[PDB]
């Protein structure tokens, strides 16, 4: 599932993201948008040979199981493609162990590079929540 900017920043908010770990709605939308453009069904290949699934790009190195990540763990305890169902639910959960782990969203280097620092309210400003 492609989403539009506000129907994830609402998705992500109703399932408890606002906030979470003290990072804004916005945070999160921007992290979504330039880790995978808002597509649940992202995939790319690390060089290491791990993959990042889903909406916030969840490695395989360390968060899920693909059968293909020799020596990896399973922290959030799901198949890596939970994180590619149009319904967030498992990317949202898996994301939060994510956050609360000590390094809080510097986890995504896309958000530490891109949003940190930044106006990341402008990703929610317009839309209904
Ligand atoms: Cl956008
Ligand atoms: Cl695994
Ligand atoms: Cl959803
Ligand atoms: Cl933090
Ligand atoms: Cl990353
Ligand atoms: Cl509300
Ligand atoms: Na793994």
């Known amino acids: 599932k492609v989403f539009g900017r506000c129907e994830l920043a609402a998705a992500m908010k109703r399932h408890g993201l606002d906030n979470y ?24 290949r690390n060089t290491d040979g791990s993959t990042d699934y889903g909406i916030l790009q969840i490695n395989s190195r360390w968060w899920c199981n ?4 020799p020596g990896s763990r399973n922290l959030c305890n799901i198949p890596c493609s939970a994180l590619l169902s149009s319904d967030i ?21 896309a958000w530490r590079n891109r949003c940190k620092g ?8 317009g839309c209904r929540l």
Do not use: H, P
Not at 118 to 125: K, P
């Open 118 to 125: 930044t106006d990341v309210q402008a990703w929610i400003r």
């Open 66 to 69: 693909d059968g293909r990540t």
């Open 89 to 109: 639910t498992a990317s949202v959960n898996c994301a939060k162990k994510i956050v609360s782990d000590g390094n809080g969203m510097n986890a995504w280097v």
């Open 21 to 44: 770990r003290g990072y804004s709605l916005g945070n999160w939308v921007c992290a979504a948008k330039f880790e995978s453009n808002f597509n649940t069904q992202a995939t790319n």
